């Protein structure tokens, strides 16, 4: 954390300033009441909103003038890494768990490959929401998690 | 000889064969056992003279 | 049974090809394949393009043998024909190669004796270290 | 047509799936752009 | 020349003998399978090493193996 | 008595060099003939590199499994 918060970084302010002037420059050729003008003014308003949020959410900045992320585990920045991540692992786990629920449903059947190239959508729709409680995979792990043959 | 317009009447129209991947080839219409099946399906898709040996069918 | 012998028999009609024999035939070896044709027919030459079979006995000289079997195999199917091929050498000695035992190799014959067969099949062979320094090789066993 | 349903759910199932995903992702961004962090906690 | 071996795992299908481009293998009487025949490599001097034989064996593991060895004119497939 | 594993029985391969090595498969038949090195033909649900689903094995090359 050898950095300075973005709220109080001159370089971070110079970037917002320089960016807006560039978009405003383009604003000149199109005159006022105009489609491009409204499009550029919308980018400018989207630009201000962006920088505003970064400062607002206490993100440090580097001498470069750009925010940098802390992933150490520090509590002030869970938003930077840890919070989104857990969110990921939830979804990743969801997808994988549902995907594995399908293969087991498919495995003891006729031609199993037939449903791997042509999806059983009724079956899939039945199993998709099981991923919602996928971290109760843990309780499968206490018993039938993985194969004993290997 | 005399040149003229020659045609034949309806020769089938159904979604039945859409539901059956690799129908055009007798080897590959049985379905996949390995992932090689999938690649072969796209590589022999336009090989018409590999599908049948009748010149009339290939031409059509 | 004794193999057939030859040779003074005519050869097929061809125009000339670049795939023909070379110095190897002159100083190392060359091969001859012979067959009996029922009709005067046209066939694809392994070395070249197209040649005409001559009705009756036929004689063809090819380099390498594989060329001999490739043509011969084609002769067996396609048209039904009986063929044989020999290895010439340069001195003049000749050597009967195929079939070599009456019958073709696909068909089991009682005269034949096995060569290079390991009765402990499988990949039950020993590790290379075991034969290390012993001229042997694991498969040879 | 059973069969038509059958053409579907092939790798057309992938594109229908990913097109839906792309749409959802795009709308989210249109709604919440330039997000470098999760700021709700 | 190359080295070619056969194993009692052979079932006498005879496919390799049919596959070989240079007449290396042949079948001989045996009593280890229902076909009562087994492959043999009596002419490994004419082999080229293309492994068409191996490519045609249905045993779980090949019952005919080709160990590429010392190179000769015959094995190098040279017409010159 | 009859020679090998029952017909319905599923077995575990012990070939090592077999594709379906530490896996299982069901026996189809057993050649009743002595002198036959490898009887006990077996078939597998999944195909090997050579696209074949069946192979013969020695008696000591299979373990009955339940
Ligand atoms: C290299 C060659 C190769 C090839 C060609 C394949 C090919 C395939 N693999 Mg294999 N795989 C490979 C190597 C390969 N794999 C290797 C090396 C491994 C590691 C050992 C694996 C491990 C593996 C696993 C574990 C799985 C596969 C699966 C698959 C199949 C997925 C098909 C698919 O995505 O449809 C589409 C998939 C979707 C999820 C689309 C979503 C469909 C939803 C659920 C229903 C439809 C909703 C609808 C469309 C949306 C509505 C919106 C609309 C109204 C707008 C496909 C046949 C999967 C399979 O078998 O399929 C079931 C499977 O689970 N592979
Ligand atoms: C390099 C190895 C390493 C590892 C594996 C960790 C791991 C961790 N750190 Mg640490 N950290 C490290 C190096 C490391 N750190 C270094 C070099 C520094 C110097 C700054 C720090 C400074 C630091 C601070 C200030 C904090 C952490 C915290 C954490 C924990 C946050 C995860 C959590 O909340 O629980 C898991 C949550 C769920 C599973 C949901 C986690 C155990 C945080 C903590 O103490 O946790 C309470 C925290 O406050 N770290
Ligand atoms: C126009 C003719 C046509 C074309 C272009 C294709 C093309 C394809 N086929 Mg299909 N096929 C066809 C006819 C065709 N097929 C017919 C008539 C049949 C039945 C006989 C089949 C049966 C068939 C099977 C069984 C399979 C294919 C598969 C495939 C895919 C190969 C795997 C791959 O791309 O990797 C990666 C796959 C993807 C990237 C999925 C996404 C594909 C869509 C088109 C992109 C989505 C766009 C996205 C929303 C925006 C861009 C996002 C960006 C980040 C990429 C490829 C997309 C394989 C497959 O798709 O595996 C899942 C497969 O298993 N085909
Ligand atoms: C008049 C134009 C024409 C026509 C009608 C054909 C027709 C045919 N060709 Mg020929 N070919 C052509 C031009 C043509 N070719 C040219 C210009 C070349 C030089 C490259 C070739 C080289 C060629 C080879 C080497 C082969 C053929 C073969 C074939 C036959 C089967 C091919 C097939 O199934 O399609 C299948 C189609 C695909 C699998 C699509 C693959 C996608 C390509 C490879 C990449 C496309 C990328 C795209 C351009 C941009 C990227 C987008 C991406 C990110 C989504 C078929 C008779 C095959 C044959 O055996 O003949 C009997 C064969 O092996 N062609
Ligand atoms: C044809 C052009 C078109 C237009 C004019 C719209 C317009 C809209 N979309 Mg749609 N969308 C489109 C195409 C389009 N979309 C396509 C092609 C897809 C993929 C199939 C989507 C997928 C999509 C999703 C998932 C959502 C929208 C939503 C919205 C609305 C924003 C609601 C709001 O108040 O914000 C603020 C909302 C807060 C919660 C804050 C808005 C009316 C949203 C909606 O209204 O839900 C039904 C929504 O989340 N769109
Ligand atoms: C794997 C590496 C990686 C990672 C970690 C990221 C991460 C990110 N990217 Mg990048 N991106 C990447 C690769 C990556 N990207 C590549 C290879 C390309 C080239 C195609 C891009 C091109 C790209 C563009 C153009 C943009 C991003 C943006 C973003 C940010 C947007 C987060 C968001 O959408 O809001 C949140 C979204 C969710 C929370 C969706 C999940 C919720 C589900 C759907 C609902 C489930 C509820 C339970 C995020 C920091 C955007 C940004 O503005 O940066 C700050 C943006 O403009 N990326
Ligand atoms: C107990 C949790 C409380 C606590 O640790 O205080 C967290 C403390 C202090 O925490 C810090 O407090 C500061 C106050 O000066 C600030 O408020 C910071 O925001 C806050 O993060 O920090 C740590 O001790 C971090 C320990 C990390 C240790 C590194 C290796 C981790 C080994 C764990 C292995 C498991 C892997 C999974
Ligand atoms: C397939 C189709 C069908 C499936 C769909 C079914 C599911 C339907 C669910 C849809 C519901 C939508 C939920 C809406 C959620 C709100 C979205 C939102 O909040 O906007 C995104 C929001 C932020 O949004 C912000 O909100 C602010 C609040 O007022 C303002 O609105 C700002 O405009 C906006 O930007 O939060 C985020 O999650 C973005 C955080 C990004 C996290 C990135 C950090 C990771 C980068 C670093 C980590 C590196 C990792 C690499 C590791 C390897 C390193 C070696
Ligand atoms: C946006 C966002 C998010 C999300 C996330 C997610 C949800 C995801 C995902 C994703 C996914 C789900 C993915 C994927 C992918 C995959 C891939 C990309 C692959 C592949 C492949 C490959 C490439 C392979 C290859 C191979 C093979 C196959 C075999 C062997 C060899 C090799 C390796 C070659 C979050 C919130 C978190 C954060 C922020 C925002
Ligand atoms: C028409 C036609 C044609 C063509 C067409 C074309 C050319 C096309 C295209 C197309 C395309 C080319 C497309 C596309 C698309 C894309 C998309 C739709 C996207 C996306 C995505 C996303 C959603 C993203 C995501 C993300 C983010 C942002 C965050 C994190 C990371 C990631 C990356 C994941 C032709 C001529 C052939 C002919 C026929 C007809
Ligand atoms: C804390 C933290 C950190 C560090 C960390 C670490 C270092 C850790 C770790 C880690 C580890 C060391 C881990 C491990 C593991 C393991 C294992 C062993 C696994 C497994 C698994 C499984 C079995 C799964 C399965 C599944 C599921 C569950 C879901 C989906 C489907 C599937 C199947 C995929 C950092 C500083 C970066 C950041 C802050 C926070
Ligand atoms: S091909 Fe394989 S199995 Fe068939 S005979 Fe020759 S060796 Fe025995
Ligand atoms: S390798 Fe080619 S040449 Fe040598 S034996 Fe097997 S098939 Fe005949």
Swiss-Prot record, chain B:
Portion of the full sequence shown: 17 to 76 of 758
Record family assignment: Belongs to the PsaA/PsaB family.
Compartmental location: Plastid, Chloroplast thylakoid membrane
Functional note: PsaA and PsaB bind P700, the primary electron donor of photosystem I (PSI), as well as the electron acceptors A0, A1 and FX. PSI is a plastocyanin-ferredoxin oxidoreductase, converting photonic excitation into a charge separation, which transfers an electron from the donor P700 chlorophyll pair to the spectroscopically characterized acceptors A0, A1, FX, FA and FB in turn. Oxidized P700 is reduced on the lumenal side of the thylakoid membrane by plastocyanin.
Subunit structure: The PsaA/B heterodimer binds the P700 chlorophyll special pair and subsequent electron acceptors. PSI consists of a core antenna complex that captures photons, and an electron transfer chain that converts photonic excitation into a charge separation. The eukaryotic PSI reaction center is composed of at least 11 subunits.
Protein name in the entry: Photosystem I P700 chlorophyll a apoprotein A1
Entry superkingdom: Eukaryota
Native source species: Pisum sativum (Garden pea)
UniProtKB/Swiss-Prot annotation, chain E:
Main location group: plastid
GO cellular component: chloroplast thylakoid membrane; photosystem I
Cofactors demanded by this protein: [4Fe-4S] cluster
Enzyme Commission (EC) number: 1.97.1.12
One of the GO BP terms on file: photosynthetic electron transport in photosystem I
Location of the protein in the cell: Plastid, Chloroplast thylakoid membrane
Binding residues for [4Fe-4S] cluster 2: 20, 47, 50, 53
Cofactor note: Binds 2 [4Fe-4S] clusters. Cluster 2 is most probably the spectroscopically characterized electron acceptor FA and cluster 1 is most probably FB.
Entry annotated with the keyword Repeat: yes
Family annotation (SUPFAM superfamilies): 4Fe-4S ferredoxins
Domain 4Fe-4S ferredoxin-type: 1-30, 38-67
Membrane-related topology note: Peripheral membrane protein
Catalytic activity: reduced [plastocyanin] + hnu + oxidized [2Fe-2S]-[ferredoxin] = oxidized [plastocyanin] + reduced [2Fe-2S]-[ferredoxin]
GO molecular function annotations of the record: 4 iron, 4 sulfur cluster binding; electron transfer activity; metal ion binding; oxidoreductase activity
InterPro entries: 4Fe4S_Fe-S-bd (IPR017896), 4Fe4S_Fe_S_CS (IPR017900), PSI_iron-sulfur_center (IPR050157), PSI_PsaC (IPR017491)
Keywords: 4Fe-4S, Chloroplast, Electron transport, Iron, Iron-sulfur, Membrane, Metal-binding, Oxidoreductase, Photosynthesis, Photosystem I, Plastid, Repeat, Thylakoid, Transport
Binding sites annotated in the UniProt record for [4Fe-4S] cluster 1: 10, 13, 16, 57
Self-association state and partner proteins as the record states: The eukaryotic PSI reaction center is composed of at least 11 subunits.
NCBIfam families: PS_I_psaC (TIGR03048)
Biological function: Apoprotein for the two 4Fe-4S centers FA and FB of photosystem I (PSI); essential for photochemical activity. FB is the terminal electron acceptor of PSI, donating electrons to ferredoxin. The C-terminus interacts with PsaA/B/D and helps assemble the protein into the PSI complex. Required for binding of PsaD and PsaE to PSI. PSI is a plastocyanin-ferredoxin oxidoreductase, converting photonic excitation into a charge separation, which transfers an electron from the donor P700 chlorophyll pair to the spectroscopically characterized acceptors A0, A1, FX, FA and FB in turn.
Protein name, UniProt field: Photosystem I iron-sulfur center
């Amino acid at each position: 954390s050898g950095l300075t918060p973005c709220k109080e970084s001159k370089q971070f302010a110079k970037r917002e300033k320089q960016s807006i002037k560039k978009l405003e420059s383009s604003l000149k050729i199109y005159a006022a009441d105009s489609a491009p003008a409204l499009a550029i003014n919308a980018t400018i308003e989207k630009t201000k909103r962006r920088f505003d949020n970064y400062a607002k959410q206490g993100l440090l900045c580097g001498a470069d003038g750009l925010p940098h992320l802390i992933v150490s585990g520090d509590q002030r920045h869970w938003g930077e890494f840890i919070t989104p991540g857990i969110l990921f692992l939830y979804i990743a786990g969801w997808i994988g768990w549902v995907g594995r629920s399908y293969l087991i449903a498919i495995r003891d059947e006729k031609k199993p490959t037939q449903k791997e190239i042509i999806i059983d959508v009724p079956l899939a729709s039945r199993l998709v929401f099981r991923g919602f409680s996928w971290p109760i995979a843990a309780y499968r792990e206490l018993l039938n998690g993985e194969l004993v043959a290997k | 000889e005399v040149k003229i317009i020659l045609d034949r009447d309806p020769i089938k129209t159904s979604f039945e064969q859409w539901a059956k991947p690799g129908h055009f080839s007798r080897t590959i219409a049985k379905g996949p056992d390995t992932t090689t099946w999938i690649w072969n399906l796209h590589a022999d898709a336009h090989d018409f003279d590999s599908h049948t040996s009748d010149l009339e069918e290939i031409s059509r | 049974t004794p193999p057939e012998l030859d040779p003074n028999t005519p050869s097929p009609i061809f125009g000339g090809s670049t795939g023909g024999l070379l110095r190897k035939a002159q100083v190392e070896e060359f091969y001859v394949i012979t067959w009996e044709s029922p009709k005067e027919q046209i066939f694809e030459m392994p070395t070249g393009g197209a040649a005409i079979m001559r009705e009756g006995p036929n004689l063809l000289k090819l380099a390498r043998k594989e060329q001999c079997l490739a043509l011969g195999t084609r002769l067996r199917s396609k048209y039904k024909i009986k063929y044989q091929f020999y290895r010439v050498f340069p001195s003049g000695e000749v050597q009967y190669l195929h079939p070599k035992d009456g019958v073709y190799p696909e068909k089991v014959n009682p005269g034949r004796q096995g060569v290079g067969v390991n009765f402990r099949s499988i990949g039950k062979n020993v590790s290379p270290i075991e034969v290390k320094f012993t001229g042997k090789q694991p498969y040879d066993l | 047509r059973d069969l038509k349903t059958y053409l579907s759910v092939a790798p057309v199932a992938s594109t229908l799936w990913f097109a839906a995903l792309a749409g959802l992702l795009i709308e989210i961004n249109r709604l919440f752009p330039d997000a470098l962090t999760f700021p709700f906690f | 020349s190359h080295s070619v071996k056969i194993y009692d795992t052979c079932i006498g299908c005879t496919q390799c003998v049919r596959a070989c481009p240079t007449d290396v293998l042949e079948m001989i009487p045996w009593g280890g399978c229902k076909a009562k025949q087994i492959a043999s490599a009596p002419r490994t001097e004419d082999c080229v090493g293309c492994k068409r034989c191996e490519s045609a064996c249905p045993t779980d593991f090949l019952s005919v193996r080709v160990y590429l060895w010392h190179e000769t004119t015959r094995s190098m497939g040279l017409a010159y | 008595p009859p020679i090998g594993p029952k017909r319905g029985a599923k077995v575990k391969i012990l070939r090592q060099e077999s594709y379906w090595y530490k896996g299982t498969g069901s026996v189809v038949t057993v050649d009743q003939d002595p002198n036959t090195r490898y009887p006990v033909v077996v078939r597998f649900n999944k195909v090997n590199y050579a696209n074949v689903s069946t192979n013969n094995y020695a008696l000591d090359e299979v373990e009955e499994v339940k």
